């Protein structure tokens, strides 16, 4: 049927929690290399380029 | 006697081709079509047979006026004008 | 001739008289089992139907 529950609501505190945890993990070099991004020559992992 | 021998007497005809729907369902003694109900002004249709409804409906035939209606609608039934000549 | 199905014997007579410049004696019509109507047009005795058919193009 079409009226299978396709959609799942997540609590807002948990959605912000997961954004916080994923951001926090995107600053540790082991976890992003274990994700497989080739970063073995980037000069700093929270890689902030200036606003130009 | 009620089977093979009694099938031999089948030489009359209950129905004929209808002048409205074209099917061989025009009952001759009743003078009425058993598919479209010809002497009645309204077409015989029933909601208990949707397959029979979709066998002869507006999609099924030639649409020789309505496919032109559907085309003239897209320019809003513009009439009395031509394209600009050479 | 093969004629139109709606055409009468009178119409077949006047059509042949106008088209091929002749005068006919009688017209027989039948409708062939393919649906086309066929007309046997008998010409008047002063005309020669072989010469008329040669002028039409059939021989």
């Amino acid at each position: 049927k079409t009226w299978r529950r396709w959609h799942r609501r997540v609590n807002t505190t948990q959605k912000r929690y997961a954004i916080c945890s994923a951001l926090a993990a995107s600053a540790l070099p082991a976890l992003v290399m274990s994700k497989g991004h080739r970063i073995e020559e980037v000069p700093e992992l929270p890689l902030v380029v200036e606003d130009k | 006697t009620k089977g093979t021998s009694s099938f031999g007497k089948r030489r009359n005809k209950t129905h004929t081709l209808c002048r409205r729907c074209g099917s061989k369902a025009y009952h001759l003694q009743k003078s009425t079509c058993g598919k479209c109900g010809y002497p009645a002004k309204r077409k015989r249709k029933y909601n208990w047979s949707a397959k029979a409804k979709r066998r002869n409906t507006t999609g099924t035939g030639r649409m020789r006026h309505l496919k032109i209606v559907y085309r003239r609608f897209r320019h809003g039934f513009r009439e009395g004008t031509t394209p600009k000549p050479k | 001739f093969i004629v139109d199905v709606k055409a009468n014997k009178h119409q077949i007579k006047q059509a042949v008289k106008k088209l091929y410049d002749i005068d006919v004696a009688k017209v027989n019509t039948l409708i062939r089992p393919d649906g086309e109507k066929k007309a046997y047009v008998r010409l008047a005795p002063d005309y020669d139907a072989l010469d008329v058919a040669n002028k039409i193009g059939i021989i």
Partner: protein, 50 residues
């Protein structure tokens, strides 16, 4: 029968003309998948309704 309605005769005329085989030049068309006429009616086998 030999006694016939004009409408019955014209119906028989159409169903006579539809009972011929396919011409062979159809067979060499580009997007052809048509090989023989599957709408052939034999008078002894199938009986036209009517």
């Amino acid at each position: 029968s030999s006694h016939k309605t004009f409408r019955i005769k014209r119906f028989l005329a159409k169903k006579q003309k539809q009972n011929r085989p396919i011409p062979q030049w159809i067979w060499m068309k580009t997007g052809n998948k048509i090989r023989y006429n599957s709408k052939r009616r034999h008078w002894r086998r199938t009986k036209l309704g009517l």
